[PDB]
């Protein structure tokens, strides 16, 4: 069956190369999680540095796309970096052509449309990645938009990606059934970051040191990643709780 | 070396009560030399009428091109093009050749078959639409035609009155232009009959 | 590097089937149910917003898209394929019509262009067919109200009413029972909601149903006044609130 | 590389047949039957719709019969979408001819160019052929009324009466039996319907499953009129020939 | 086996079979020896005839006044590569007034052969080359192979039964490396080397091809009556 | 047009007038000629308004994409991007640009790119039609390592003279202060600077 | 003559209604006020066809952009797309545009020149009548205009052009774009150049014109 | 199945078998290492002495990029040279536009994105090398290791080829017992040792040692080869540590 080798339909109407690309998504064995505050959007991903020879500072799956847009990838790093460089190019071209900063959901749609073309043209393989885009959009406010190798995308109140994703998901769905609202009702990003880490710990049943996480925060008019120290501060706050 | 005035010729269109008129002269020349006494400058695609003044090769070319485009239109739309729509097709097509234009002064006349409304328009050689309720003029004696139309014209003329006005406007404007005249044709256009009259005029 | 696939990936089998079109239609069968009904004074298109996760915000996913002020589209099948077809459909309405005639294309000729794009993906080198069927509802001055289905092959047909995807067989039977040539637009919306109730498992409300109409002109949606002969879009998306009003009287 | 996934749509079988042309013809043999009959005073085109649903919009649809110009029409058997690509090409080609010569295109010239395009898809470019057979009905001042067919091979031939699509073997027997040369258009109409009536895979032939067109001289003195029959006009002809 | 249909496919053990099959064409080729002192570099090639009525295939090609090579394998592939090297020697001259370094010649051949081993529809070069030259840093011998691997040596041999001459040169190393300012003695040590690769036949007068380049010696090819001296 | 950039102790100050003319007609009397290509890399524009706007827009694009990939670009890097555009397109461009920037390592830097697309690193730079009249004045009064207040005065006096003699210059004196403390916009009105 | 004036809660653009070919008036009531999008309007001076064509191209691309992004179009997008297009053509596209509108970002007023230079302002004028109009704007404009004050100032500035510039005449067209509300397009807001009743009717006695031939034309099938 | 016959095909695992096969050709190669030090990086490689006929010192395998970047690789040597050629174009292009020499992380992604591109299509074969590279920029010293998938990270020390596990074992020991840093001159000696140690896993043929380094103090942030007294000094150091 060569219908399993390129992006053409199988008899039951499926694209196996898209399905197999979704499986490559989990090769890194990393779980990601994004939630929205009132004023901010927080994205946390597990950080795992197995080899002692690695420079731990260069090991990341969170990318600064634009001034305002951050992206976390679940998938192998080469495809992650391909997707990163392309999103950066697209967000810069948009700003030059149309005179305003590319919105989160529009970049998401554009990367999803690119992903779709790989599912329809034979000579391009899909990328084995899921892209989570976060920002505080000037029109829509705190935003989470996620893209997969199918070229699917949608907005989220919160989301999780990776192997243990289903546990994190139901944990968050439970919080939002209780809380009755669209977001984390919190003033400061520091306390939304604490919420994100706390609910990841509950769902995964594991503790984290400062070196086991990597954190991204979007506020109005910038996205930034936390240093080891910024997270230590954050982990200490959770300890005394 | 002024393409718009090598061959000569004029077109004028007027609206009346539930009718339009479009008229043209019959001269084709090569500067001083009168060559042809029968070069008509008014064509029609269904019920929509187009007059073209200017360089005669571009008159012939644009007619052949609009017959082509309105034929394909009719086959795909399953109805004749309307004057408002044709006007936009002329405009698009002229502006497509922005940096290599057709040296012409096109004039559209017709009655919208649905609304019953009389419609005229004119354009510059690159596609700009002048839409006027009253009259449109084009060609080597456009100054003379503007003068005649602006005095002679009054609104809501019956087809048989409108005929006298447009005819007198064209006839007396052509007589003051070296490169226009040599015979004239006038189309009187009502909702569902079109009368075409050849005017007797001085042959100098 | 570059595309070396300049040969067709859709070819005739000995039986005269086109494998990849057949398989695209199988993808459409698996797709969520969508339908369209044509009244005397308008058209309704409706589908289910079967949400992937409950954490998803399914209003950010529009299955019913405006193509022109007077034309709307809905699909069954692969969502990404639909999204890029809507992008190409909107653009071709401009490049191959509006930029020439200074007016939006009539329904059948925009459909004709969409059909053309989908046919090319059936025969061009190095591509698979689109895995969607579209229902396109539209109005134009000379043709009035119309409803069209477009299939992966590039074939299109006009319908008084129809359905596509999952429960299409049952849905079409139900529409045959109820459809008459004297339906008022509100009658057609009522029938559309009944028909869609059959092939919806869980929640049935204004947040799980996407419904748009091609109806009267909406000057209140135009965005400007002062030109009396511009009277605004005939395509209107029914709000979550508006759908729930008609579910109490269901 | 990519060679591995190439069907080779433009090669010969060991018997010197074009696989993809043969399989396209097999595809066309399952399409609604189309009949062309040429009389001394006009041409008939009749085609049977792929089984209609009670809810399909009958009048606004054109599955089978298309206008190429004011003097030429085609009946289609095969993939509708494939046919529409070729028809828009033919319509342009006719308009190029009119633009160049200021004369309506002779029927054969149009047919030959469309047939030459189909041929190309069987010899170069490695694409699938068009899954379409056309019956061309047209008139020009050289040969008068003409019927042609073309098929995916790019081969074309002229006919007095011909059928394409389903049950052509059956339909060509019945036409060969009842066709006469002196025949007038009104008789040819009756022959076309009687022939579909007998070859149809349906229980009964009704107005809502038929597309019908004539090309007559039946207007004003030596000028040609194309008639694409409305639902009501077919329904009336179906009763007058006594099939309902 | 399943992984040898093209140059763009790795085997499960990480081999390129189309390149290995290319390398096989050299093994089947007639033997050629290269060796150098500090002052001169010599090529000796055994030329192969089709039958008793045919010319003996030319093995040695001149690339510039200071550079040339010997071939074993597909002769047309040698013609393409030698032509490419002639152009690179030319370009160096006309643009920089600079005689092309034998080391740079090596690197350029390597990168040209490499493109054909990584792209679809192409094929590896089916020829091996020994490049001798005298540049600004003295005498040089290079071994080229269509994998792209270029190697600088004191001496070597390639083609049929090349192993014999390659072991002899490995034994002789310390003797021939110091035949400085003697042309005839380096040539005879080259002729002795190629003689280790002969079976059921020895060096005749239209059989044997010798080339030399050195300090005050343009690259020049000796054939026919002008190699009788050396048998 | 009268434009200058002056390096000082804490960083660099950019100055410009606000007058744009079509012949003798003042098309705009409140023009902003001080334009941001990065947080702390700005330029002063002189020449074709179309050409310098198109260039500045492309440079802002390149530096925003540079930042995405390699972080904050140096003032030298920004000047090098301007030069590349100006030099390679010298036959179709009428653009005289002063590039001024503040790195935290390199402090205040000024680069001038005259009509040829050559680059010159200078302690201070003057350009525009009005600059001819203040070469004498600026050469005599400029000292290295001035204070913020001294440098603001030096620019105000300098452009005051350029405005007085050049008909092409006039309106308000706009300035942009670039230091570690961030970014400060200053405006000085006729009724102030005229009677200096 | 075209003007733009900013006010508290929006921007107003105005234009005269004269079209000229050399010294001749081609159109006594042309519309120079163009819609790029529902709440972004354009006033055009220069080569007539160029201002209409460039306004429609960017208007089309802005509509597609709005649909792609699910957002109201912004004036800064219309500005950037127009300037980049005009620049590419090095001034050969003779378009001089006053671009005004309201978007989620607020109210904006810009001028674009044929070569691709743009200007920001609270009041602007363009065209042959720009000096007449700018004299009135520089005489009367103040910060914090009301809606009614901005309309009056804009129409006063156009009237200066109508009266004192031979390139401008006939009527005043206004478009008001207020934040929150629909843009209102006041076609022929002012009509101070009505043609006086003529001394005479030049209506001819029927049969005055001499005719050679008649025929019915066939427009049917 | 047959998912391993074509580059860019995903297996049901979600793996690209052609990339995994490329790794085998890399694992088959000679040993090469990199060591990050205080103010620089040190590169070293094992060169199997095929024959006595190999001219010693004259088959250089460490390649310079720009003036400040060293590159060494194990696997198919021509594939390595091809990747460095591309790197040199990228660094030239970067310097041409931005004036400053290419920063090492910037340069890393240029090789990364290029190598990754050769896993996107079936018309190309993945690279048959793992590449150890780096040098000194405005931000200090950087060592990278790049794999046939396009995967790369920053490294404290790195090794690839036949002796990778022996090399990695010895590198992990340096990292543990020098957590405050290693000097550039020390790293040259250690490099010599680890190549001599890792050579045991490859010891039919005896080998030639080759070292290079960029040090902000020792070479002024430029890439130079280790020659003469300093090479012989590190050869002698390694000869002590094997007995
Ligand atoms: C206020 O300041 C007021 N001043 C008046 C005026 C006239 O200056 C104007 O700018 C108007 C505005 C337009 C009104 C119509 C709506 C769009 C805006 N501009 C014109 O009227 C221009 C004047 C003009 C400007 C620049 C020119 O450079 C060549 C020429 C003329 N009018 C036209 O361009 C004119 C329009 O013709 C209308 C018309 C309609 C129907 C029938 C006939 C005529 N046409 C031409 O000038 C034709 N001209 C031919 C040659 N050409 C050209 O480019 O030749 C080639 C070979 C190079 C292609 C250019 C066009 O309004 C302001 C606001
Ligand atoms: Mg694919
Ligand atoms: Mg006359
Ligand atoms: Mg005369
Ligand atoms: Mg002054
Ligand atoms: Mg210019």
Report on the structure:
- The structure is cut from a larger assembly and holds 8 protein chains of 8 kinds.
- Chain A is built from 6 helices and 10 strands.
- Chain A is an alpha+beta fold and 241 residues long.
- Chain A has one domain: Aminohydrolase, N-terminal nucleophile (Ntn) domain (Glutamine Phosphoribosylpyrophosphate, subunit 1, domain 1), CATH 3.60.20.10.
- In chain A, the strands form 2 sheets. A 5-stranded antiparallel β-sheet of chain A has the order 8-1-2-9-10. In chain A, strands 3-4-5-6-7 form a 5-stranded antiparallel β-sheet, with helices on one face.
- In chain A, helix 5 crosses helix 6.
- Chain A starts with 15 loop residues before the first helix and ends with a helix.
- By secondary structure, chain D is α+β, with helices and mostly antiparallel strands.
- Chain D has one domain (1-244): Aminohydrolase, N-terminal nucleophile (Ntn) domain (Glutamine Phosphoribosylpyrophosphate, subunit 1, domain 1), CATH 3.60.20.10.
- Chain D contains 6 helices and 10 strands.
- In chain D, a hairpin with a 3-residue loop joins strand 5 and strand 6.
- The longest helix of chain D is centred in the middle third of the chain and has 22 residues, at 80-101.
- Chain D is globular, with a radius of gyration of 18 Å.
- The relative contact order of chain D is 0.20.
- With 231 residues, chain E is of the alpha+beta class.
- Chain E has a single domain, classed as 4-Layer Sandwich (Glutamine Phosphoribosylpyrophosphate, subunit 1, domain 1), CATH 3.60.20.
- Chain E has helices at residues 17-28, 75-96, 102-115, 162-176, 183-194, and strands spanning 32-36, 40-46, 60-64, 67-73, 127-135, 138-144, 150-153, 155-158, 208-214, 217-222.
- Chain E has a 5-stranded antiparallel β-sheet with strand order 8-1-2-9-10, with helices on one face. A 5-stranded antiparallel β-sheet of chain E has the order 3-4-5-6-7.
- In chain E, helix 4 runs antiparallel to helix 5 (183-194).
- Chain E is globular and about 50 Å long.
- By secondary structure, chain H is α+β, with helices and mostly antiparallel strands.
- In chain H, 37% of the residues lie in helices and 24% in strands.
- Chain H contains 6 helices and 10 strands, in the order αββββααββββααββα.
- In chain H, strand 3 and strand 4 (69-75) form a beta hairpin.
- In chain H, helix 2 (77-98) crosses helix 3 and helix 4 (164-176) runs antiparallel to helix 5 (184-198).
- Chain H starts with 16 loop residues before the first helix and ends with a helix.
- Strand 12 (193-199) of chain B pairs antiparallel with strand 13 of chain G, so a sheet runs across the interface.
- One magnesium ion (MG) is lined by residues 6-7, 118, 121-122, 124-125 of chain A.
- One magnesium ion is lined by residues 48, 50-51, 92 of chain F.
- Chain B: It is found in: Cytoplasm; Nucleus.
- Chain B: There is a cross-link at residue 69 (Glycyl lysine isopeptide (Lys-Gly) (interchain with G-Cter in ubiquitin)).
- Chain B: GO terms for molecular function: endopeptidase activator activity.
- Chain B: The modification Phosphoserine is found at residue 30.
- Chain B: InterPro entries: Ntn_hydrolases_N, Proteasome_beta_3, Proteasome_bsu_CS, Proteasome_sua/b, Proteasome_suB-type.
């Amino acid at each position: 069956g060569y219908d399993r080798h390129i992006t053409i339909f199988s008899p039951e109407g499926r694209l196996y190369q898209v399905e197999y690309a979704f499986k490559a998504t989990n090769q890194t064995n990393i779980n990601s999680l994004a939630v929205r505050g009132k004023d901010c959007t927080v994205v946390i991903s597990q950080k795992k540095v197995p080899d002692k020879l690695l420079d731990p500072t260069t090991v990341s799956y969170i990318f600064c796309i634009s001034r305002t847009i951050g992206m976390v990838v679940n998938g192998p790093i080469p495809d992650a970096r391909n997707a990163a460089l392309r999103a950066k190019a697209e967000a810069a071209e948009f700003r030059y052509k149309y005179g305003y900063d590319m919105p989160c959901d529009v970049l998401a749609k554009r990367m999803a449309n690119l992903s779709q073309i790989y599912t329809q043209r034979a000579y391009m393989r899909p990328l084995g990645v899921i892209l989570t885009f976060v920002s505080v959009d000037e029109e829509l406010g705190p935003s989470i938009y996620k893209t997969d190798p199918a070229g699917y995308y949608v907005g989220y109140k919160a989301t999780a990606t990776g192997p243990k994703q289903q546990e994190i998901t139901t944990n968050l769905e439970n919080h939002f059934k209780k809380s009755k609202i669209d977001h984390i009702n919190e003033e400061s990003w520091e306390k939304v970051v604490e919420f994100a880490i706390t609910h990841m710990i509950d769902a995964l049943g594991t503790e984290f040191s400062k070196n086991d996480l990597e954190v991204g925060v979007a506020t109005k008019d910038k996205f930034f990643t936390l240093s080891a120290e910024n997270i230590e501060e954050r982990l200490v706050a959770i300890a005394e709780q | 070396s002024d393409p718009s005035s090598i061959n000569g010729g004029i077109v004028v269109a007027m609206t009346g009560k539930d009718c339009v008129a479009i008229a043209c002269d019959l001269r084709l020349g090569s500067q001083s030399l009168g060559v042809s006494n029968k070069f008509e400058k008014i064509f029609h695609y269904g019920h929509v009428f187009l007059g073209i003044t200017g360089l005669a090769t571009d008159v012939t070319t644009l007619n052949e091109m609009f017959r082509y485009k309105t034929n394909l239109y009719k086959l795909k739309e399953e109805r004749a093009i309307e004057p408002e729509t044709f006007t936009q097709l002329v405009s698009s097509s002229l502006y497509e050749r922005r940096f290599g234009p057709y040296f012409v002064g096109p004039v559209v006349a017709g009655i919208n078959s649905k609304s019953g409304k009389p419609f005229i328009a004119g354009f510059d050689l690159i596609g700009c639409i002048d839409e006027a309720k009253d009259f449109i003029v084009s060609g080597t004696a456009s100054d003379q035609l503007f003068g005649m139309c602006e005095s002679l014209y009054e609104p809501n003329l019956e087809p048989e009155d409108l005929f006298e006005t447009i005819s007198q406007a064209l006839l007396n404007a052509a007589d003051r232009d070296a490169l226009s005249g040599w015979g004239a044709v006038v189309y009187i256009i009502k909702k569902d009959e079109v009368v075409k009259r050849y005017l007797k005029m001085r042959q100098d | 590097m570059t595309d070396r696939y300049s040969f067709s990936l859709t070819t005739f089998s000995p039986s005269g089937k086109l494998g990849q079109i057949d398989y695209a239609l199988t993808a459409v069968k698996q797709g969520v149910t969508s339908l369209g009904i044509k009244a005397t004074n308008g058209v309704v298109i409706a589908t289910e917003k079967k949400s992937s996760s409950p954490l998803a915000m399914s209003e950010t996913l529009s299955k019913v898209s405006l193509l022109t002020p007077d034309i709307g589209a809905v699909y069954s099948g692969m969502g990404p394929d639909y999204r890029v077809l809507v992008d190409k459909s909107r653009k071709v309405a401009h490049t191959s019509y509006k930029r020439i005639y200074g007016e939006y294309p009539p329904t059948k000729l925009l459909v004709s262009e969409v059909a053309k794009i989908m046919q090319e993906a059936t025969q061009s080198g190095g591509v698979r067919p689109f895995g969607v069927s579209l229902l396109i509802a539209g109005h134009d001055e000379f043709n009035g109200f119309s409803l069209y289905q477009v299939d992966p092959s590039g074939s299109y047909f006009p319908w008084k009413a129809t359905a596509i995807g999952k429960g299409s067989v049952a849905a079409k039977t139900f529409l045959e029972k109820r459809w008459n040539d004297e339906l008022e637009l509100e009658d057609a919306i009522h029938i559309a909601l009944l028909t869609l109730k059959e092939s919806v498992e869980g929640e049935f409300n204004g947040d799980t149903i996407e419904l748009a109409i091609i109806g009267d002109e909406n000057p209140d949606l135009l965005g400007y006044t002062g030109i009396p002969t511009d009277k605004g879009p005939r395509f209107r998306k029914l709000t979550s609130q508006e759908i729930n009003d008609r579910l109490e009287a269901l | 590389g990519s060679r591995r996934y190439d069907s080779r749509t433009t090669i010969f079988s060991p018997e010197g047949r074009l696989y993809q042309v043969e399989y396209a013809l097999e595809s066309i043999s399952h399409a609604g039957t189309a009949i062309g009959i040429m009389a001394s005073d006009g041409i008939v085109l009749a085609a049977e719709r792929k089984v209609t649903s009670t809810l399909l919009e009958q009048d606004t649809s054109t599955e089978k019969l298309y206008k190429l110009n004011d003097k030429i029409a085609v009946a289609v058997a095969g993939l509708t979408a494939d046919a529409e690509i070729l028809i828009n090409t033919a319509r342009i080609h006719a308009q190029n001819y009119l633009k160049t010569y200021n004369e309506d295109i002779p029927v054969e010239i149009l047919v030959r160019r469309l047939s030459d395009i189909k041929q190309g898809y069987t010899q170069h470019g490695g694409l699938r052929p068009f899954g379409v057979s056309f019956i061309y009905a047209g008139y020009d001042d050289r040969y008068g009324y003409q019927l042609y067919t073309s098929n995916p091979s790019g081969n074309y031939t002229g006919w007095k009466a011909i059928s394409v699509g389903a049950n052509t073997s059956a339909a060509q027997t019945l036409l060969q039996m009842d066709y006469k040369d002196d025949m007038k258009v009104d008789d040819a109409i009756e022959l076309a319907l009687k022939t579909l009536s007998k070859t149809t895979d349906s229980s009964a032939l009704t107005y809502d499953r038929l597309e019908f067109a004539t090309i007559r001289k039946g207007a004003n003195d030596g000028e040609v009129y194309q008639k694409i029959f409305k639902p009501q006009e077919i329904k009336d002809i179906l009763v007058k020939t006594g099939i309902t | 086996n399943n992984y040898d249909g093209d140059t763009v496919t790795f085997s499960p053990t990480g081999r390129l079979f189309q390149v290995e099959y290319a390398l096989e064409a050299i093994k089947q080729g007639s033997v050629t020896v290269g060796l150098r002192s500090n002052t001169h570099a010599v090529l000796v090639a055994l030329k192969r005839n089709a039958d008793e009525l045919s010319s003996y295939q030319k093995k040695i090609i001149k690339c510039d006044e200071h550079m040339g090579l010997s071939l074993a394998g597909l002769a047309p592939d040698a013609r393409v590569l030698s032509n490419y090297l002639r152009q690179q020697c030319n370009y160096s001259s006309l643009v920089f007034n600079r005689k092309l370094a034998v080391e740079r010649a090596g690197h350029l051949l390597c990168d040209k052969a490499q493109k054909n081993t990584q792209s679809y529809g192409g094929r590896p070069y089916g020829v091996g080359l020994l490049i001798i030259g005298y540049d600004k840093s003295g005498a040089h011998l290079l071994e080229f192979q269509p994998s792209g691997n270029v190697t600088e040596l004191y001496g070597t041999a390639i083609g049929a039964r090349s192993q014999g001459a390659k072991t002899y040169l490995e034994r002789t190393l310390d003797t021939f490396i110091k035949i400085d300012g003697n042309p005839d003695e380096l040539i005879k040590a080259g002729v002795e080397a190629i003689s280790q690769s002969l079976r059921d036949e020895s060096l005749t007068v239209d059989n044997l091809s010798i080339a030399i380049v050195g300090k005050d010696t343009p690259f020049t090819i000796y054939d026919g009556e002008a190699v009788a001296k050396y048998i | 047009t009268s434009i200058m950039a002056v390096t000082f102790k804490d960083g660099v100050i950019l100055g410009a007038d606000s007058r744009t003319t079509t012949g003798a007609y003042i098309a705009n009397r409140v023009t902003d000629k001080l334009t941001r290509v990065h947080d702390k890399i700005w330029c002063c524009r002189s020449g074709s308004a179309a050409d310098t706007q198109a260039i500045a827009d492309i440079v802002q694009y390149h530096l925003e994409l540079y930042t995405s990939q390699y972080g904050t670009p140096s003032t030298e890097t920004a000047a090098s991007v301007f030069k590349e555009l100006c030099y390679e397109n010298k036959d179709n461009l009428t653009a005289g640009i002063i590039v001024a920037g503040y790195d935290d390592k390199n402090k205040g830097e000024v680069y001038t790119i005259p009509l040829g697309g050559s680059v010159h690193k200078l302690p201070y730079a003057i350009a525009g039609s009005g600059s001819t009249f203040i070469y004498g004045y600026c050469d005599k009064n400029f000292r290295e390592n001035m204070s913020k207040e001294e440098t603001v005065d030096f620019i105000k006096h300098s452009l005051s003279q350029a405005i007085k003699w050049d008909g092409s210059s006039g309106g308000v004196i706009r300035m942009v202060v670039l230091t570690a403390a961030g970014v400060e916009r200053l405006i000085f009105y006729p009724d102030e600077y005229e009677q200096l | 003559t075209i003007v733009g004036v900013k006010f508290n809660n929006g921007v107003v653009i105005a234009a005269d209604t004269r079209s000229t070919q050399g010294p001749i008036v081609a159109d006594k009531n042309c519309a120079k006020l163009h819609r790029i999008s529902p709440k972004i309007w354009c006033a055009g001076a220069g080569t007539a066809a160029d201002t209409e064509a460039v306004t429609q191209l960017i208007g089309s691309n802005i509509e597609l952009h709005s649909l792609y992004t699910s957002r109201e179009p912004r004036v800064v997008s219309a500005l950037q797309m127009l300037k980049q297009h005009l620049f590419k053509y090095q001034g050969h596209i003779g378009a001089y545009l006053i671009v005004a509108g309201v978007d989620p970002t607020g109210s904006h007023l810009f001028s674009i020149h044929a070569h691709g230079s743009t200007d920001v302002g609270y009041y602007l004028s363009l065209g042959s009548g720009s000096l007449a109009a700018m004299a009135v704007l520089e005489s009367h404009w103040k910060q914090d205009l009301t809606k009614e004050e901005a309309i009056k100032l804009a129409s006063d500035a156009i009237q200066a052009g109508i009266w004192n510039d031979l390139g401008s005449g006939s009527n005043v067209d206004v478009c008001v774009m207020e934040i929150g509300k629909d843009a209102e397009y006041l076609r022929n807001y002012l009509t101070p150049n009505v043609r006086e009743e003529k001394q005479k009717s030049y209506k001819f006695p029927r049969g005055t014109t001499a005719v050679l031939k008649e025929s019915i034309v066939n427009i049917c099938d | 199945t047959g998912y391993d016959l074509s580059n860019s095909v995903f297996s049901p695992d979600g793996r690209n078998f052609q990339v995994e096969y490329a790794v085998k050709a890399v694992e088959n190669g000679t040993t090469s290492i990199g060591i990050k030090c205080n103010d620089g990086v040190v590169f070293a490689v094992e060169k199997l002495i095929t024959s006595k006929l190999l001219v010693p010192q004259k088959n250089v395998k460490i390649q310079v990029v720009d003036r400040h970047i060293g590159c060494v690789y194990s696997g198919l040597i021509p594939d390595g040279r091809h990747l460095v050629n591309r790197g040199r174009e990228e660094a030239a292009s970067f310097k041409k536009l931005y004036k400053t020499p290419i920063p090492i992380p910037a340069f890393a992604d240029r090789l990364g994105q290029y190598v990754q591109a050769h896993t996107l299509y079936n018309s190309v074969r993945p690279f048959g090398v793992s590449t150890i590279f780096g040098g000194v920029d405005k931000n200090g010293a950087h060592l990278y290791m790049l794999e046939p998938s396009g995967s790369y990270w920053g490294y404290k020390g790195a090794a690839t080829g036949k002796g990778r596990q022996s090399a990695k074992a010895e590198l992990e020991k340096l990292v543990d017992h020098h957590p405050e840093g290693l000097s550039a001159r020390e790293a040259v000696k250690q490099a010599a040792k680890i190549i001599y140690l890792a050579h045991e896993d490859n010891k039919e043929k005896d080998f030639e040692l080759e070292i290079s380094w960029c040090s902000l103090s020792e070479t002024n942030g430029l890439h130079k080869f280790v020659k003469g007294d300093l090479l012989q000094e590190a050869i002698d150091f390694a000869q002590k540590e094997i007995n």
